[PDB]
């Protein structure tokens, strides 16, 4: 990932979003 | 706490993909 895309993902988790609920919503 | 991605968290994910990022490479990086 580019530097920025990492930030967006990081912040996206730190917002109180479990990778699970994320991967689920994804795909 | 809703568990359902917020209206904004969806945008961030959407845009995150449309930036030319395959869900695969994404889920992978996500662990």
């Amino acid at each position: 990932l580019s530097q920025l895309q990492t930030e967006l993902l990081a912040a996206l988790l730190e917002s109180g979003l479990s990778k699970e609920a994320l991967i689920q919503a994804l795909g | 706490m809703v568990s359902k991605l917020s209206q904004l968290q969806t945008e961030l994910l959407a845009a995150l993909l449309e930036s030319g990022l395959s869900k695969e490479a994404l889920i992978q990086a996500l662990g």
Binding site: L4, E7, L12 | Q9
Partner: protein
């Protein structure tokens, strides 16, 4: 609680100090607080904005911000009451939490 209420002189006296302590200032000729932020690069800057944005959604209160590469100038004030309210203080505190956990 209805609509926001502009902070009373008592509230301002007990909530503003901690924020000025770390760089926030009241704008002249307008009831609002502001602070300039600087980061390593745009990426960091936008990561910061993104985190702040997510909290802004949870609070339903949004900042007046200007961004140029790695700089982010933020102005907070509540439109409903034409001035500072709990909301501004609330959001500002969260912004400090984030702008500090990135050093």
């Amino acid at each position: 609680a209805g609509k926001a209420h502009r902070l009373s002189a008592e509230e301002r006296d007990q909530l503003l100090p901690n924020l000025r302590a770390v760089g926030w200032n009241e704008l002249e000729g307008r009831d609002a607080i502001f602070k300039q932020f600087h980061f390593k690069d745009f990426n960091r800057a936008f990561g910061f904005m993104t985190r702040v944005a997510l909290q802004a959604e949870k609070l339903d209160h949004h900042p007046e911000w200007f961004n140029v590469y790695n700089k982010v100038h933020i102005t907070l004030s509540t439109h409903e009451c034409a001035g500072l309210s709990e909301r501004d203080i609330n959001l500002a505190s969260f912004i400090e939490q984030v702008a500090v956990s990135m050093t």
